[PDB]
Each structure stands twice: as C-alpha cells, then as structure tokens.
Amino acid sequence: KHLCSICGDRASGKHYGVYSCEGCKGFFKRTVRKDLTYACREERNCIIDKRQRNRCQYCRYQKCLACGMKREAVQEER
Amino acid sequence: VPPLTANQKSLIARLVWYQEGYEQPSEEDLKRVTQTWDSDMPFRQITEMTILTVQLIVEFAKGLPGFAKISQSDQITLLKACSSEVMMLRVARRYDAATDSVLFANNQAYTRDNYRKAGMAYVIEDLLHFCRCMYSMMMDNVHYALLTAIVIFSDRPGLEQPLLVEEIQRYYLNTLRVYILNQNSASPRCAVIFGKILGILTEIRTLGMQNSNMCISLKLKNRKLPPFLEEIWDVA
C-alpha cells in the first residue's frame, strides 16, 4: 500500500528502516555491500523520483540516508 | 535437510536391484507359458502370467530386510494380503498411455477389449483408471521400490507381532521421506509428494477387493482359477 519515501515508486514494505521500493532497496544494498562512493555531476540536489532516480547515484544514495536507511541494517553477503 | 545412512542407501540400492531383478519372469518360464504358434486363450495367458507375477512378488518380499524376522504365520499373512496389491503397482509400471493398454512380459499389449473376452471385463475399467493416475504421477524406481516394500509390511489383520511389522515398515516409510526430501528442495511440496504417494496405498486396497470379487465371480462362473491363486487370495 505504501510509497517509497525516497522516490515515490510503490514500496514493497520497509527495507533497512524505511518504506522503499525494490529499486531503492537493491541500490542501497549494493552501495553498502561494495562500499561504493559516488560523485554528483551537478550540485548534489538532483531530482530522485520514480522517473529519473537512475540519473544520479550520489543523490539517490544521499536520499536513502536522509529518508532514514541504515547502513548497519545491510548484512554481510550470504 | 539431511542425507541418508549407509543402511538406507544400501537398501534403496538393494531394492532398486531386486525390483529389476524381478520385474519379469525368467526367459524360460516366460518361454514355457507363452508357447504357441475360444475364450480360454486370453484367459489362459492372463491367469498363467498372473501366477508368475505373484511368484516374483513373493520372492521379492523375502529379499526384504526384516522379513525373515517374521513368524511363518505372519509372513504368509503379510504376503497373502500384499500379493494382490503389489501386483497392482506392477501393472502400473507396464501401462502404455499411448494405447491405454497393459503390456505383458511377452511384449504383448492387452486392451480393455482383451480383458473383456477373457471374462475379466469387470476388473479392467478401474485397473486402467488407476494406471492413468499412476502415469501422471510420474514416479521414479526408488519410489516404486520403497512403496512396494511399505505395502508388504502394511498392517494386516491376523498379525501376531503387529507392533513389530509397524516398525519394520516405519523404516521404509522413513527412508522414502528422506529420499523425497533430498530429490527436491526440502520445501512445502516435499510433503505433497510424500502424501500423494502414501495415497496410492488406499487406492490399492480398492483394487485388491476387486481382484478378489473377480476371483469369486470366476469360481462362480465355474472357471478354474489356478489353485495357486485360489489359495493365496483366500478365494473360497
């Protein structure tokens, strides 16, 4: 029923602390697992919605953080 | 999500071996009965072939772990009740969906029409339905061997050490559980499979009574049912 708090896509439930879609779930997992750092090619205020969330990895990750996603909730690879 | 002991696999192995060891009657026996280059012909073959089937079924039963631990009284008790029900598992294995017929050990296909002629017209419509149901079941030779074993140590009336057999059976019942638990992800469907299989037991009980009624409705038609069969199925 819920919406992803990051992008507005249909949430599949809570993930890593926040209501979020499979997209943002999968993205946050891969970012934390690999310990990736991104660089915005704009002004670090890019639009992150259901339409253009894939345009800026830095801004998508920062928005996961601001929404309340917890790096600690991401477990070791199994 | 465990595997199986050595016993278990030695048994499964063993059972899969005896099964092929006895699926058909020897080349000489088969040759002797099938000699020949009028409603007594289909009748003779069907009845004569059944006497071979039963024999094989009996010997297989003795090649079973724990069987010799049974009182001769019980042994003839278990065997006497299983004879007709296993013979059922074995007609399923030689059923051909393409022709809806049963294939005798001499490679001949017997249709619902042949069983008519021989006066077995009563037993066939149901026997063939059970085959179609065992077909879509799609079972492997382990199942079939294990299942068979089970049927044999199935609780029967007249049993002296009833509680004994129950366990001699609990083993095979258990082995089957495991083998199914490995062959597929020990997931939900794992029981669903174990169940449909154990269900074969109850259907095999209905086809057993029909075989008996056929023996009856045959003695009554004054038609010599081999003494051997009349004896083993308690056909009065």
Partner: protein
C-alpha cells in the same frame, strides 16, 4: 530555445537519430534488441500506457509501439548488407 534534445519515445535526453528517429540510448538499445529477437510483447495494463522514464521499463509492448509510431525503422536494424554477411 532547445534546452534539451528529447527522445520522441520517452522524453529522456536524446543522444542522436537512431533508425531514423530522435531517441535516447535506452530506446535505441531496446528497439534494436526487440527487432533482432522479433520479440512479441503483451501489455499487462490497458494497452495504452503513456511512455516516460518510469513506464518505459514497465511496459515493453507500449514502448515498442511508441518506437514504431515515432518512425523507428525496423528494416534498418541489421539489414542484409556486406557488414552483416561479415559477423
């Protein structure tokens, strides 16, 4: 005036003319893949999805219909020229 060259299919930033239509890399690749496989898609909605950056990933049937409607030429995807007899 022209602040951004627009993909005629989805409205994403167009990278150039692909198979005779101003399209993004996403729609270019989707169209080429759809044509080379001769893919037949089945919309699981109402057979009338408006294409954007969200819906383009959601409905392959309507995206392909939009690619054609915009003027993408399927005959221009790996035609039988000398270069193809190569690979």
């Amino acid at each position: 005036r022209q602040q951004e060259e627009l993909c005629l299919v989805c409205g994403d930033r167009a990278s150039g003319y692909h198979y005779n239509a101003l399209t993004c890399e996403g729609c270019k690749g989707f169209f080429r893949r759809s044509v080379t496989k001769n893919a037949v898609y089945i919309c699981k909605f109402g057979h009338a999805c408006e294409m954007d950056m969200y819906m383009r990933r959601k409905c392959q049937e309507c995206r392909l219909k939009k690619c054609l409607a915009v003027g993408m030429r399927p005959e221009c995807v790996v035609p039988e020229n000398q270069c193809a007899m190569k690979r």
